[PDB]
Amino acid sequence: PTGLAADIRWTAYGVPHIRAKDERGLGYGIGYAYARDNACLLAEEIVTARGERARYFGSEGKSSAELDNLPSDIFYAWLNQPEALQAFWQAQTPAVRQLLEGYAAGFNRFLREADGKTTSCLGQPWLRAIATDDLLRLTRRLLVEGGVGQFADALVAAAPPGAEK
Amino acid sequence: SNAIAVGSERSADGKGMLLANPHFPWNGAMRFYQMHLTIPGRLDVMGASLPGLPVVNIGFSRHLAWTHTVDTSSHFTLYRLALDPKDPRRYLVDGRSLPLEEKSVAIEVRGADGKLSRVEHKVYQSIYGPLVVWPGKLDWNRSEAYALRDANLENTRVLQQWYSINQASDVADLRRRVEALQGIPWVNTLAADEQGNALYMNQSVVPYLKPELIPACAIPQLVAEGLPALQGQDSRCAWSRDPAAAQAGITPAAQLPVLLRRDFVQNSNDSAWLTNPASPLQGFSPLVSQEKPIGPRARYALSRLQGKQPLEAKTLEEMVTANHVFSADQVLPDLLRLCRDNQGEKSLARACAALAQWDRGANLDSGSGFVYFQRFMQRFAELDGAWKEPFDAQRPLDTPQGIALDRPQVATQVRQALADAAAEVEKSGIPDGARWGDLQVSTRGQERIAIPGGDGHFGVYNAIQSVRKGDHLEVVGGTSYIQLVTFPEEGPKARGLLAFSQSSDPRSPHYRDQTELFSRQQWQTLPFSDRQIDADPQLQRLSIREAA
Numbered sequence: 048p049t050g051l052a053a054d055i056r057w058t059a060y061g062v063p064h065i066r067a068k069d070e071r072g073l074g075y076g077i078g079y080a081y082a083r084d085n086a087c088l089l090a091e092e093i094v095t096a097r098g099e100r101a102r103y104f105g106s107e108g109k110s111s112a113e114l115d116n117l118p119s120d121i122f123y124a125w126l127n128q129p130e131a132l133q134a135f136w137q138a139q140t141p142a143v144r145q146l147l148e149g150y151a152a153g154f155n156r157f158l159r160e161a162d163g164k165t166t167s168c169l170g171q172p173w174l175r176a177i178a179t180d181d182l183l184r185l186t187r188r189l190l191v192e193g194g195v196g197q198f199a200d201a202l203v204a205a206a207p208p209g210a211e212k
Numbered sequence: 213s214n215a216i217a218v219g220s221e222r223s224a225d226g227k228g229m230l231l232a233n234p235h236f237p238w239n240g241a242m243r244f245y246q247m248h249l250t251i252p253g254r255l256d257v258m259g260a261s262l263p264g265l266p267v268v269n270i271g272f273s274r275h276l277a278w279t280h281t282v283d284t285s286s287h288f289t290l291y292r293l294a295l296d297p298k299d300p301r302r303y304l305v306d307g308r309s310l311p312l313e314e315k316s317v318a319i320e321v322r323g324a325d326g327k328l329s330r331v332e333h334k335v336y337q338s339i340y341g342p343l344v345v346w347p348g349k350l351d352w353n354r355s356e357a358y359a360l361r362d363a364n365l366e367n368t369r370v371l372q373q374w375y376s377i378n379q380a381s382d383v384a385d386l387r388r389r390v391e392a393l394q395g396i397p398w399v400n401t402l403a404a405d406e407q408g409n410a411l412y413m414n415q416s417v418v419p420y421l422k423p424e425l426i427p428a429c430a431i432p433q434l435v436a437e438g439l440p441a442l443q444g445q446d447s448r449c450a451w452s453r454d455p456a457a458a459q460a461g462i463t464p465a466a467q468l469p470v471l472l473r474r475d476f477v478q479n480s481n482d483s484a485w486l487t488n489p490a491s492p493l494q495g496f497s498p499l500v501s502q503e504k505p506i507g508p509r510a511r512y513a514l515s516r517l518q519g520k521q522p523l524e525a526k527t528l529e530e531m532v533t534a535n536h537v538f539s540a541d542q543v544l545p546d547l548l549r550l551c552r553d554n555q556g557e558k559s560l561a562r563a564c565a566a567l568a569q570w571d572r573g574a575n576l577d578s579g580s581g582f583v584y585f586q587r588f589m590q591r592f593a594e595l596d597g598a599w600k601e602p603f604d605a606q607r608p609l610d611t612p613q614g615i616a617l618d619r620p621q622v623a624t625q626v627r628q629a630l631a632d633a634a635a636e637v638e639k640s641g642i643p644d645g646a647r648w649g650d651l652q653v654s655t656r657g658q659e660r661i662a663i664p665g666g667d668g669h670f671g672v673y674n675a676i677q678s679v680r681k682g683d684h685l686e687v688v689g690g691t692s693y694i695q696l697v698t699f700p701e702e703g704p705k706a707r708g709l710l711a712f713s714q715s716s717d718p719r720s721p722h723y724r725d726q727t728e729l730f731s732r733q734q735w736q737t738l739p740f741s742d743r744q745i746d747a748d749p750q751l752q753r754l755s756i757r758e759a760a
């Protein structure tokens with residue numbers, strides 16, 4: 048019929064075993080299981096990759112990578128511009144698109160049902176339904192960890208000289 | 213990270229075996245998470261992954277196990293720009309003045325009043341990429357500036373790449389799939405399969421420059437320091453094109469290091485060079501792999517791996533769980549001799565006793581000798597010419613070794629280094645009796661758990677990084693997802709742990725359960741077959757669905 052469906056088994060220590068008939072159902076299971084354990088972590092890291100840390104937390108805080116909120120936000124706003132995200136999505140295979148669509152839907156399903164049993168950030172304005180673009184933002188953040196990501200502060204600091212001697 | 217793949221010629225069962233020991237953060241966007249994925253008939257893979265990714269990053273399947281370590285290859289280049297003498301916002305390529313591009317981003321900032329303000333920021337860009345400034349080294353003055361070209365910005369293949377790896381049957385298939393797509397951004401890949409092949413690949417996305425361009429296109433001062441820096445005023449220094457590469461400007465797969473053997477391969481973040489010393493990997497671009505002295509983790513691994521005795525699963529496990537501080541093997545014997553030559557030097561007395569009684573480990577019950585040794589090494593690192601036997605490229609596994617105590621200046625500086633280290637240790641708040649496990653911990657809510665292991669720079673295979681917080685050292689990264697895989701007839705047997713546990717949320721039943729196990733170094737079955745899964749008395753099942 049449609050659309051997304053997954054069978055999840057958990058063994059000791061909360062390890063999920065996800066079975067599905069296609070990538071979309073598989074992603075659904077992954078997103079739901081991961082949310083049960085780590086919704087707050089993902090939401091925080093998505094705020095970072097969206098360049099919204101200063102909006103929620105102010106200029107005095109840092110990301111989990113220990114970058115100041117504003118320079119981090121400038122870097123991720125630069126990296127994850129709409130045109131970059133859309134080019135990236137357009138280059139994805141149907142299978143990968145489906146994995147990501149399922150993941151977002153599964154994470155969101157858990158959020159709809161969450162009553163705080165395994166989620167400490169219930170009620171925070173930054174804990175919100177996610178989109179496939181948010182997963183692209185996280186992916187690109189990881190992609191550049193071996194490159195321009197290590198120069199985030201240096202990019203933000205790059206300004207032309209003044210009148211100095 | 214460590215990785216060891218063992219093949220049919222060395223494994224006790226004549227089949228493949230893989231130890232995966234990545235060293236990664238215990239929190240945040242790189243926190244590993246275990247999962248098993250199955251689309252019956254065509255996908256069945258288990259391992260661990262990074263947050264947000266719907267694929268397995270390090271794992272195993274019916275006939276194959278693989279893992280990754282961060283490589284030494286460059287994945288970007290800096291470009292030194294020659295600025296227009298009339299305008300520092302313009303730069304010269306082949307003598308022609310080009311304008312920088314400007315891209316403004318706007319950010320909302322929550323103020324003290326709790327309201328949002330808008331902040332705009334200009335990002336300057338060249339044809340190579342954005343400009344970057346490191347004050348005092350990479351400045352933007354009226355003569356020069358630096359731009360950065362990141363090779364992975366155009367790597368749209370990265371998710372596809374791991375999904376493809378997740379579908380791989382054996383080592384040959386894995387190699388085909390990685391070489392075909394070239395979507396791996398910044399790690400090596402090591403793998404073993406049931407038939408007993410052991411594979412190392414330095415197959416990642418690396419800027420390509422034809423060999424004849426490198427001498428003139430490099431910035432000599434900067435590459436000497438290990439920065440991949442090129443001359444950005446010459447159009448001939450653009451990354452080279454080769455139709456065989458999966459992406460314009462990257463190095464084709466055939467020019468990247470691969471070693472396929474039946475004995476072993478290993479990597480602990482050094483270059484491809486001594487993956488297996490019996491078959492050194494040489495002759496590659498400096499952007500890819502260089503013959504640099506290996507670090508103590510690799511030197512430790514090779515000391516255990518070399519030779520003719522069969523390797524058992526237990527052997528690989530215990531290379532991790534022994535917590536041996538391998539750097540001590542090079543300096544501790546001569547250091548203790550200095551201690552013996554200096555009894556009655558009251559300032560060295562406590563340090564010398566602690567070092568002498570020390571088990572040379574980073575175990576929970578290792579004594580304060582480890583702490584003294586760490587602080588001494590931090591200072592020894594920085595002394596000039598103090599090795600008795602300095603690095604010998606003809607003996608890259610056995611050097612450097614020893615302290616040059618027969619040189620009076622060295623003996624003087626080494627003793628002073630120990631005196632200073634001892635002083636530092638003793639003016640810290642460390643009690644009497646205290647063992648390493650009393651000091652290094654992972655906080656869980658209102659409680660702590662003692663964590664074994666120590667910094668990888670001291671040659672501890674079980675690498676653990678911690679930072680001082682209050683009365684303790686708080687673990688921030690290191691050993692994370694552990695998997696040790698063998699292939700008996702029934703199906704793959706995987707054993708390991710996720711050191712920091714599945715959940716980062718203090719409310720979860722899975723916030724500290726594996727962390728208690730990691731403390732006691734008690735690895736567990738990673739159940740993969742339906743039979744293994746059904747045998748778990750903790751088994752729970754949920755089926756979920758919703759409309760598209």
Ligand SMILES: *[B]([O])([O])[C][C][C][C][C][C][C][C][C][C][C][C][C]
Nearest residue numbers: 189190213234235269280281282
């Ligand atoms: B070690 O200390 O060298 C750490 C290496 C482990 C990191 C392996 C992660 C697998 C890479 C996934 C990248 C995905 C990018 C989107």
